[PDB]
């Protein structure tokens, strides 16, 4: 017997997480998904599933799984849910209205905040339109906020579209960095590729 376990370690324990605007996607397929690895964890700030019970995750098969991950600030984690609005849901990472899957987050202040501010983590503050679900925009075009053209240069009412969180360890809990993992579960008209343990 060969039991290819889905590499959830590579997702949850990654040393580096993506900026939310450049959110990372890892395909999870042709593997046994064993969620029991998370059962004895208690420092996740949120762990919610949509269309499936967390209690049944080891008892279900899916045609495909994606693991999306990124960093946002604590009071933005509420936007990583179906039917949300705000700067993250609108301009950075958009879940579908009928999302099937799980959203897990945890405070990463210790790893991701620096005295003086961590400027490595960015989000998109400006966009002409909202993202479609699971859309990614990594464009760096200067945003026209006023009546005057920008000509691809920063200036008055002409803003670089990405802005830094500048995470500092003494930020309020709502402004501290949180690492987020979104597990997307597909149930298409195709063979199951991801099942819980037998």
């Amino acid at each position, epitope marked *: 017997n060969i039991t290819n376990l889905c590499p959830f370690g590579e997702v949850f324990n990654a040393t580096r997480f993506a900026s939310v605007y450049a959110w990372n996607r890892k395909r999870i397929s042709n593997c046994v998904a064993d969620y029991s690895v998370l059962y004895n964890s208690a420092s996740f700030s949120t762990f919610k599933c949509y269309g499936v019970s967390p209690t049944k995750l080891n008892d279900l098969c899916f045609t495909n799984v994606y693991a999306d991950s990124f960093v946002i600030r604590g*009071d*933005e984690v*509420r936007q990583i849910a179906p039917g949300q*609005t*705000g*700067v993250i849901a*609108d*301009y950075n990472y958009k879940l579908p209205d009928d999302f099937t899957g799980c959203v897990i987050a945890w405070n990463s202040n210790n790893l991701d905040s620096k005295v003086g501010g961590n400027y490595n983590y960015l989000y998109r*503050l*400006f*966009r002409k339109s909202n993202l479609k679900p699971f859309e990614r925009d990594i464009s760096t075009e200067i*945003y*026209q*906020a*006023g*009546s005057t053209p920008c000509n691809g240069v920063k200036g*008055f*009412n002409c*803003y670089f579209p990405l*802005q830094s969180y500048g995470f500092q360890p003494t930020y309020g809990v*709502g402004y501290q960095p949180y690492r987020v993992v979104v597990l997307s579960f597909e149930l298409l008209h195709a063979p199951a590729t991801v099942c819980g343990p037998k």
Partner: nanobody, 126 residues
Framework: QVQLVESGGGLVQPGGSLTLSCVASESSLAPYRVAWFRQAPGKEREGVSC??????????YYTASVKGRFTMSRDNAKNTVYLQMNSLKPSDTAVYYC?????????????????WGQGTQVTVSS
């Protein structure tokens, strides 16, 4: 082409309250971030508060000096934003301006700065 008229300013004693109104004409404010700024003569413009298109507490920002004392809000049906000022100090004396731009969202560091009202004087004294 959006036009903004601040009102509600006047003389108030320390500890008193005031509600500023920023009424927009010629365009809808509803899709856009709006900010309150203030300027005392001699000192440059500074941001007071910023509200985003989602009008959520998490996307609404205040400068350190007014946190806990001032509340910004919007009524999209009246095309109007408010600054509720309680526990007014002498140091709150200034001309109050509202501004908007084409951004949907405030950041702590980036308020709208494209279109401005003429402003309303707020004086906290005897």
């Amino acid at each position: 082409q959006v036009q903004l008229v601040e009102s509600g300013g006047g003389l108030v004693q320390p500890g008193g309250s005031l509600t500023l109104s920023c009424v927009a004409s010629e365009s809808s404010l509803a899709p856009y971030r709006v900010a309150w700024f203030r300027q005392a003569p001699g000192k440059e413009r500074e941001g007071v508060s910023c509200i985003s298109r989602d009008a959520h507490p998490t996307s609404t920002y205040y400068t350190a000096s007014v946190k806990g004392r001032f509340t910004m809000s919007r009524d999209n049906a009246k095309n109007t934003v408010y600054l509720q000022m309680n526990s007014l100090k002498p140091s709150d004396t200034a001309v109050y301006y509202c501004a908007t731009d084409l951004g949907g969202y405030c950041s702590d560091s980036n308020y709208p700065r494209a279109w401005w009202g003429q402003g309303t004087q707020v004086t906290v004294s005897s």
